[PDB]
Nucleic acid binder design. Structure first.
Ligand SMILES: C[As](C)(=O)[O-]
Ligand SMILES: C[As](C)(=O)[O-]
Ligand SMILES: [K+]
Ligand SMILES: [K+]
Lengths: 66, 59
DNA sequence: CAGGAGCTTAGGAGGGGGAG
DNA sequence: CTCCCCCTCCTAAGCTCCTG
């Protein structure tokens, strides 16, 4: 019912990108831990990593384009 | 009823109207909404997104 | 309240796995 | 065919900005 589209703050994005640096496919336990730090549901941080891995794929293609 | 999925035949009518006008008024969006059997709300969001996909490919 | 824009999150199809 | 799980590709959609 509620889709506030989970707009991430910079502090939230900071912990996310930190975990994304160590691992791009974190297990559920690694996703719960960062979800508590950023005070967000775990399901939002899994959709984030899914989108974040696409961003990595998009940028390598965008680089080969330019 | 959470997300519209435009078929190939619907995108033909939508991209055709977009060629005539990037910003269509509600009357024109209704005519194409009935052709594609989708609510005019989806037609407005499509053009809002169709203009961003055009400004993206302009650079 | 409308109309726009930029940004990016989030439903959905659909490959693999499990099951009924 | 259905229901979950993983994953990606695709892009409709929600929020926040502007503008009258
Ligand atoms: C975009 As019109 C003038 O056909 O409503
Ligand atoms: C066990 As598998 C990587 O084929 O889902
Ligand atoms: K409104
Ligand atoms: K898999």
């Amino acid at each position: 019912q509620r889709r506030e589209r989970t707009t991430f703050t910079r502090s939230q994005l900071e912990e996310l990108e930190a975990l994304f640096a160590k691992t791009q496919y974190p297990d559920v336990y690694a996703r719960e831990e960062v979800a508590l730090k950023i005070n967000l549901p775990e399901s939002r941080v899994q959709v984030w990593f899914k989108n974040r891995r696409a961003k990595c794929r998009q940028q390598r293609q965008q680089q080969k384009q330019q």
